[PDB]
Amino acid sequence: ASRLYTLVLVLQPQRVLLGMKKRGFGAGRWNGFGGKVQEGETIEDGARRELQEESGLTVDALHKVGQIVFEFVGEPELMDVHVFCTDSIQGTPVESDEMRPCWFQLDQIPFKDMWPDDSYWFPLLLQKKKFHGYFKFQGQDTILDYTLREVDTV
Numbered sequence: 001a002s003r004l005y006t007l008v009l010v011l012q013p014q015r016v017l018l019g020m021k022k023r024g025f026g027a028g029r030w031n032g033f034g035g036k037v038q039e040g041e042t043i044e045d046g047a048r049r050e051l052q053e054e055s056g057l058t059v060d061a062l063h064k065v066g067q068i069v070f071e072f073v074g075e076p077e078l079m080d081v082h083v084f085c086t087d088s089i090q091g092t093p094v095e096s097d098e099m100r101p102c103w104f105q106l107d108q109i110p111f112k113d114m115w116p117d118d119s120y121w122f123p124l125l126l127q128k129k130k131f132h133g134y135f136k137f138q139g140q141d142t143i144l145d146y147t148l149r150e151v152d153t154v
């Protein structure tokens with residue numbers, strides 16, 4: 001009972017791009033760029049597509065850095081989120097009716113205004129570590145339990 005999603009982080013040596021979602025699931029929080037994987041499309045092709053649709057950027061090189069499963073108590077579907085980091089990008093981030101992009105210095109990540117799980121696995125992403133995670137949520141603000149382990153292969 002799971003559904004595939006992608007999440008792409010545009011990470012450069014001194015800064016990371018995040019986008020403030022203006023409506024829908026997760027509105028009001030800074031996040032990477034992603035969404036559901038479609039029929040007939042590979043997970044990586046979906047990550048590339050979602051980055052363009054949501055940020056206006058075109059990614060050359062992409063690589064997998066994590067997989068995180070989210071459970072929301074009372075909701076049947078688990079979110080199976082495949083996390084990617086960019087290595088090269090083209091274009092300028094585009095503000096739209098759906099998303100407001102901003103670059104953040106690496107020591108100024110706005111964790112108070114992000115999903116609470118990001119405080120756990122973003123430090124790994126920043127240090128170029130790969131990870132498998134699982135977070136059980138009650139509502140959208142409370143982590144009931146979690147597991148997070150570094151791995152060599154996502």
Ligand SMILES: Nc1nc2ncccc2[nH]1
Pocket residue numbers: 007026031032070115116117118
């Ligand atoms: N970055 C990020 N964290 C999340 N936690 C739960 C659901 C979606 C999420 N996107």
